[PDB]
A paper describes a structure:
Pygo and [name]/Legless transduce the Wnt signal by promoting the transcriptional activity of β-catenin/Armadillo in normal and malignant cells. We show that human and Drosophila Pygo PHD fingers associate with their cognate HD1 domains from [name]/Legless to bind specifically to the [name] methylated at lysine 4 (H3K4me). Therefore, this is a prime example of histone tail binding by a PHD finger (of Pygo) being modulated by a cofactor ([name]/Legless).
K4me2 and A1 occupy two adjacent cavities, separated by PHD W366. The K4me2 cavity consists of a semiaromatic cage with W366, Y341, and D352 forming the walls, and V350 and A356 the base. This H bond could not be formed with K4me3 because the extra methyl group would preclude the approach of the D352 carboxyl group. In the ternary complexes, the PHD groups around the K4me2 pocket close up slightly around the peptide (arrow 1) and the Pygo loop becomes more ordered.
Author numbering:
A (entry chain P): 1 to 7
B (entry chain B): 174 to 203
C (entry chain A): 338 to 398
Write the structure that this text describes.
């Protein structure tokens, strides 16, 4: 899922 | 992969707790 | 003025905040805290390349 933690 | 598995917050929270306990399986339906 | 107003609180969703995109439907960003999502659920969803999240409103639809 797309988060702010996504690389 | 092409599949997309859709989580609610409730489901994600529950899944997360189970993952920590080593319960990683969920049964696909539709 | 916010570029990505939180789907719940309406405050800007910054890059240095835990936040998730409602990819299920509405495509708003939501602060993790606003959604009631745990840190662990947030890390899990991040790591799940095939998973997407939907906000409560979108999932109810
Ligand atoms: Zn918010
Ligand atoms: Zn939504």
């Amino acid at each position: 899922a797309r988060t702010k933690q996504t690389a | 992969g092409a599949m997309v598995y859709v989580f609610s917050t409730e489901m994600a929270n529950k899944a997360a707790e189970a993952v920590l306990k080593g319960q990683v399986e969920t049964i696909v339906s539709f | 003025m916010a570029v990505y107003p939180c789907g719940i609180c309406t405050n800007e969703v910054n890059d240095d905040q835990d936040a998730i995109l409602c990819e299920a439907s509405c495509q708003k960003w939501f602060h993790r805290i606003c959604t009631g999502m745990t840190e662990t659920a947030y890390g899990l969803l991040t790591a799940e390349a095939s998973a997407v999240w939907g906000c409560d409103t979108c999932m109810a639809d």
